[PDB]
């Protein structure tokens, strides 16, 4: 019954500001040690800031004077106000309840902050159509030329999960991302079962459903 | 300042094996250590607090021990779903210091990839770009070699590859390679092929197609 | 006429936990401050608003000696305008603090092989202490929406935590004995003076 729901991540340009939110239930934000913890792509965990139950706040050196942690007791919500954002501030930001000694037992699902000069662009979605080898066949979706990360792919609105692989995105030389999502299926079902990939790109408010067929 | 060194950085072990990850503190921190499990695309999960207390909701095969400067996280019977990165954290510090992390891979039986080649869609070629895609499906170990050939001509500098994280159920990987030509260059050639060499294969595998048919 | 009993404070065999810090009032005596500032047995001797060597030519109506045990890492919190678990929830000095903070390493006395758990600090409190406020309650702290009713459990925590002093800790984790001297100036006749 305990969850930490976070939001507020977006694409932001260097030197800009952004406020992240963390809505709690089951835990009383104002009664707990509450921390923000961030993680750059492919790097380890970095603690950012904490607010004590009594109200004292503390900040890691790399954010001291730029970030401000606060809380709204009536809304039971934790906040992280960021100013003068830098490219090295790009990371996945988590909120967590600190049990008192630094050990954090409750985490949110995280919200993504991208600090870049580049503008947002939604993805082009192209079909990877099946021919097929043996009894099983391969089909997929090419999710091309979007910015920034992340996108999330599902198949048949989430019904098709077995045999699904969504690959991590490669960064093209143009500055845009490309990524592929494929699923292996039986050859027999190709003519009597429709397959649709659902690409969701929150930074551009775009969601694409691509119906994949053979030729 | 107290430093937390974690070793090894990477380890591979078979299902059922006993795994031990070490965290060393640069000086005596009593029992003030926590262990976390982070699976790819998830928030970290608190496994152990106070060096040895198993957090509620962690399988009993996870166990911590240690005092002073040397702490161990032990997985007494490695499961495929235990693929993750494991972190230690110095507790009761002004710094909230984490260890570098240990990546734990499952060692499984050599599995050969299934190879598929995908022509560019007609829709994409309308925009003036051709993306040919080579899928390497469910293989182990992770090391694999993909070479693009366009009319027996090896390509270089015009392809990018991506590997999934280890599957949490069968411990395999999948690889995706994209060859990107302009529509102009794409139509100058006929045979498009990717050549896969992998330990599971007794000889390199070629998947080709003829632009047109 | 008689000498102020500093030895009872500094040379006391047992010291209080910081959450239950002990106060001794010192009155109606001649204070020999040379016993303290000429000692090579302290690692911290910080005075605020007054000079230690220049203390015997001063008179006060009352002197208060507060003493307790904390981590070495936390002596830095026993100062005006500090924050942290100790300053917020255990022992709070005022911003206009006039007096001295004295501390020495007591790993030789306050750590035990398997760990000494006699010393505790307050970990959970809804608000910060006022300067020189003291809280020795042991009520189960409710960290969630549902009330605890005295039963420890999830989101229901005992407010006191144990230090656990082992002799092989690093210095920051070793126990330190702290003595805070407060110099009270009332519009009342003095009772403490130096020679
Ligand atoms: C804390 O004690 C030391 C030493 O005290 C000894 O044992 C005591 C129980 C008591 O019986 C003392 O008489 C013993 O000497 C004190 O240090 C002494 O200080 C005097 C000056 O007053 C000096 O001439 C001695 O050489 C010192 N002896 C040692 C061993 O250092 C110290 O003054 C006491 N602290 C306070 C605040 O009173």
Author numbering:
A (entry chain H): 1 to 131, 135 to 218
B (entry chain L): 1 to 213
C (entry chain E): 333 to 527
What does the paper say about this structure?
S consists of two subunits, S1 that mediates receptor binding and S2 responsible for viral and host cell membrane fusion (Walls et al., 2020; Wrapp et al., 2020).
We determined structures for three members of the group, 150, 158, and 269 (the others are 175 and 222) and found that they bind almost identically at the back of the neck with similar footprints of ~800 Å2. The flat binding site of the RBD and the approach angle of the Fabs limit their H3 length (11 residues) and the number of contacts H3 makes with the RBD, which is compensated for by the interactions from H1, H2, and all CDRs of the light chain. Thus for 158, H3 makes four direct contacts (≤4 Å) and two hydrogen bonds to the RBD, whereas H1 and H2 together make 11 contacts and 6 hydrogen bonds, and the three LC CDRs contribute 6 contacts and 5 hydrogen bonds. Thus, H1 and H2 determine the mode of engagement, as seen in previous studies of antibodies with this V-region (Yuan et al., 2020b).
